[PDB]
Amino acid sequence: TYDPWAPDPLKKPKTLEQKPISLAANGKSVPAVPKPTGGYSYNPAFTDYQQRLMEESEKAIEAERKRLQELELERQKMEAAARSAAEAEAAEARAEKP
Amino acid sequence: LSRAPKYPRKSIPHEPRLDEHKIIIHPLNTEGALKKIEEQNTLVFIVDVKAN
Amino acid sequence: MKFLKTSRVCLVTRGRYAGKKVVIIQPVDQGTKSHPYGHALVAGIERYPSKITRRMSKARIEKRSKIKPFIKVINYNHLMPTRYTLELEGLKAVINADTFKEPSQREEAKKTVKKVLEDRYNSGKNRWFFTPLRF
Amino acid sequence: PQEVSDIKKFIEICRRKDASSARIKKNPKTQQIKFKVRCQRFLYTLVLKDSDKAEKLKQSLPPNLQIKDVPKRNKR
Amino acid sequence: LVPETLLKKRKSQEKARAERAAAVI
Amino acid sequence: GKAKKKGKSGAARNYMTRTQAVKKLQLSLPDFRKLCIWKGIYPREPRDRRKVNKSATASTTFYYTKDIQYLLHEPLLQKFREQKALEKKISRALGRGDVSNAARLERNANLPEKTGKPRYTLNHIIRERYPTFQDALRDLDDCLSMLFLFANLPSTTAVPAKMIARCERLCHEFQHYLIVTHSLRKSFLSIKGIYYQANIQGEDILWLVPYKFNQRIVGDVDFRIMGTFVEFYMTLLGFVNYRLYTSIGLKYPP
Amino acid sequence: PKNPLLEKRPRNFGIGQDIQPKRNLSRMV
Amino acid sequence: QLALQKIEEGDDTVLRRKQLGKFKLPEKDLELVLPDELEDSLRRLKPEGNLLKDRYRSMIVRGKLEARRKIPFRKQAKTKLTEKWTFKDFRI
RNA sequence: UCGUGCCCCGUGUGGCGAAAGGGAAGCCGGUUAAUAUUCCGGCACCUGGAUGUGGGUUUUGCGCGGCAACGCAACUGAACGC
């Protein structure tokens, strides 16, 4: 068997010792398996479940509000383009010793 | 492919040709160097011709 | 018959906006005290919208369809008139002579010009005005 | 060498980190006083009329900055 | 805007996307 | 002295793009990605990517030039070329109709679909990546989560069925070690899976195991690179199991 | 509906017009 | 004032704005049992999420590899079909 | 991802050959028995690299002004071309 822990570069470069990039917004290293909370239980406590439900509820509320707002902006942009097109069509029809 | 020789052509690598004992030969004891010692805080040495 | 009227499309031939296309907001043939020659108050495009291809995403299309406008007092000798006309209701009296005496009024006028021009560009009409001249 | 014409700019220059030293030159024949501050790239000179307020500018200059008067003879 | 129906809609969209991803000589 | 030229030092020398690295190593893209996963070569980000490559975009991948130089000396490169030449010889034997020669040469390929083991041996890589057994114990969380997940997957070309059986075997051996040393500490029934926390030689080890159901493989993951991770982690877990069994004085493998 | 800002820009490959497209030239290699 | 302005574990739910790879990672799918879907036994538990996708996301977030998309079709080499000389010269 | 490939481009070919041709950048004062635009003091510059601070630009995303000649401390710009 083989048991580890018991010109080629026999030393690794320091660039390999450099830590990888983290995509976390605080920039800190994320664990491979983060520790779960009580709100992720299959049979959760009532307070943990209600806290998670309130957080996801407000996130859904703000997401739907943003989606409706951008939909209304797109609708107003389309209506303004249609009105400008109608105005352009009407203008074309009208033209046709010290 | 890069070379992967079955024997090294040179068995022993050379020692460094220009070490410090060969680079510095002796300081200069002339009166100009002795002037420069306290005038400019400068020491004058005779060194190897191939040392930068 | 006179052709340097409102809604006339012209090309700027001199200055920082040389080569750009403008629409005449107001013609001053007799001149003013500050500009004692035939001149025009114009609004035009400084940065044309980029080309749009069929595989572009909606966000990319919205980003590339933006227009940077400008407003200008320009001598008639520095304009090349074109047979094209650009009739826009939103640009009626958007600028006057006193617009150029205050930096904030120029900002508001350029915002209005940007809105009206982007509306007309999104309509798909007057494509010659929104394509850049190659020279 | 650069001449500074504004007191606020001169105070910022004297508060810069690379301001190694400063000296005061007095020219009584022209009734003027020069404040020179040595930085990494440039020597900055502020030229003033010789006056008590020009003397009090030294107290508004930073204390950690070494400030010396120029002698009448530049001995090597 | 009922948050329960919004969360149900988001979940059903997510399972829809997940099932779509997992699916003469 | 002589005036330097622009772009000959600094970040332009410090970084290489993935295209430059692949051409420098003279590899195919799957072999390069596999080798980067196995040797721990990570993507990097220069301050100004235009100083490295004028055609770079936001999706351009960069690496350290010294890391690519280090990859030049890895013995797995000759293993890759040997396996490619061996596959050409097998194709020649089959095309000439020498079925016995083709079988004999195929026995030298060491395919995972008959051995249950990775196509290339990563034993020398294990010691390079983990200088200490404590470092191996600290990477056991990712190793155990990946292997316990892949023990419940269907057979694919990336991970064949015999390799899946070996994953299950290694996980069972690790579980038997935990049983006989009473190292298991905590467990949790979440909505995603079962969490286990054990303590081995003073190191807390937390890993997540799926509930026994049909697991869904979606196109949103890169399953072949996940298989390369599986090969590396089964090579690691074999040695971890051997060390733990030998430490508590048991015969390994059971 | 297709975007009204999409445009067709056909190329004319006659003599003295737009640059010739890249053709199969294997007969003349 | 300038000095005051200069003076004033990672969580995977909030990511940085810059992407690592071909695209910025999407927000994680909702891992939550709704109140109408709540069960009272382990047998009727409906498991949430995807563990393989979670491990892949963990790899990308911790920066061992960049995020790439699947290429279902690769561009083929431009070729021309022609008839072999023997089949052209065949006569009957 | 049929993972072990594909795409783009065309111009050829290397070297030597000028202490008066072309060419990135240093001045003054002092100093030795004998060197000095080379040493010492003061005051600068060029080339290349890395990465900060201030300032600039941006919610009308990539500055503003002048009729204009053009100006202003900044004020994106790959391939391929002029």
Radius of gyration of chain D (CA): 12
By C-alpha distance, which of F162, F165, F167, F174 is closest to F148?
F167
Considering only CB atoms, which chain E residues are within 8 Å of F217? 22
Pairing state of beta strands B24-27 and C39-47? unpaired
D23: β partners? D36, D68
CB atoms within 10 A of CB H34: 13
Query: Over H12-73, what HEC string results?
Result: CCCECCCCCECCCCCCCCCCCCCHHHCCCCCCCCCCCCCHHHHHHHHHHHHCCCCECCCCCC
Sequence-separated (6 or more) residues with CB below 8 Å from residue G7: C127
Flag whether H touches B (3+ CB pairs, 8 A cutoff): no
Strand I within 7 A of C103 CB: yes
What are the beta bridge partners of residue D47? D34
Q: In the beta sheet, which residues pair with residue C44?
A: C22, C70
**DSSP bridge pairs for F44:** F62
| Integer CA distances (angstroms), E6 to A56, E2, H42, H46, in order | 10, 6, 27, 20
* Residue length of chain D: 76
D22 phi and psi angles, rounded to 5 deg: -150, 150
Whole-number Å distance between alpha carbons of F30 and F44 = 19
d(CA F231, CA F163) in angstroms, rounded, equals: 9
C37 touches strand I (CB under 7 A): yes
What does the alpha-carbon distance between residue F51 and residue F237 come to, in Å, rounded to a whole number? 42
User: What is the number of alpha carbons within 13 Å of residue A94 lying toward its C-beta?
Assistant: 9
3-state secondary structure of D42: coil
Angle at CA C45, nearest 5°, toward C40 and C48?
160
**What tokens appear for F41 in the block?**
């070569």
Q: Which of B4, F211, C5 is nearest to A7 (CA)?
A: B4
Q: How far apart are CA G18 and CA F249, in angstroms?
A: 82
Asked if residue H52 keeps its beta carbon closer than 7 A to nucleic acid strand I, the reply is no
Q: Which of A83, A85, A91 is the closest to C124 by Cβ?
A: A85
**Searching chain H, which residue's CA lies closest to the CA of residue E4?**
H34
Please list the residues that pair with C22 across neighbouring strands.
C10, C44
Residue of H nearest to A23 (CA): H61
> How far from each other are the two terminal CA atoms of chain D, in whole angstroms?
22
Instruction: Specify the amino acid at residue A30.
Output: V
What are residue B35's phi and psi, to 5 degrees?
Answer: -65, -45
Tell me, rounded to whole angstroms, the distance of Cα A22 from its chain centroid.
Answer: 16
Q: How far is CA C47 from CA B12, B33, C19, G19, in A?
A: 70, 71, 11, 28
How far is Cα A89 from Cα E21, in angstroms, rounded to an integer? 47
Secondary element (H or E) of residue B38: helix B31-40
Q: C59 forms bridges with which residues in the sheet?
A: none
Q: What's the rounded Cα separation, in Å, for the pair H66 and H52?
A: 16
Give the residue from D74, D68, D76, D75 showing the smallest Cα distance to D25.
D68
Chain I nucleotides reached by a protein CB under 7 Å? 1-9, 24-25, 30, 32-34, 39-54, 60-71, 78-79
Report chain F's terminal Cα–Cα distance, integer Å: 70
CA of F76 to C1' of I9 (A): 35
Does nucleic acid strand I have an atom less than 7 angstroms from the CB of C49? no
User: If you compute the radius of gyration of chain F from its CA atoms, what whole number of angstroms results?
Assistant: 22
Size of chain B in residues? 52
CA–CA separation, D43 and D1 (whole Å): 5
Round to whole Å and give the CA distance between C59 and C81: 36
d(CA A35, CA A48): 15
Distance C100 CA to I55 C1' (A): 28
In the block, residue with structure tokens 């080629």: A8
Cis upstream peptide for A44 (omega within 30°): no
Resolution (Å units): 2.1
Residue at the smallest CA–C1' distance to nucleotide I53: H2
Q: What is the rounded distance in angstroms from the CA atom of residue H57 to the CA atom of residue H76?
A: 31
Measured between alpha carbons, how far apart are the two ends of chain E, in Å? 63
Out of F128, F141, F192, whose CB is closest to A40?
Answer: F192
At position A98, the amino acid (one-letter code) is P
**Dist. CA B10–CA B25, nearest whole Å:** 31
- Rounded Cα gap, residues E13 and E22, in angstroms: 14
Q: Are F199 and F205 in contact (CB under 8 A)?
A: yes
| Residue E23 contacts F where some CB pair is shorter than 8 Å | no
H or E element in which residue F63 lies:
strand F62-64
Q: How far away is chain E from the Cα of H43, in angstroms, using its nearest Cα? A: 21
CA distance E25 to chain H (A): 16
Return phi, psi of residue F239, to 5°.
-70, -35
Contacts of E8 in chain H (CB under 8 A): 34, 36
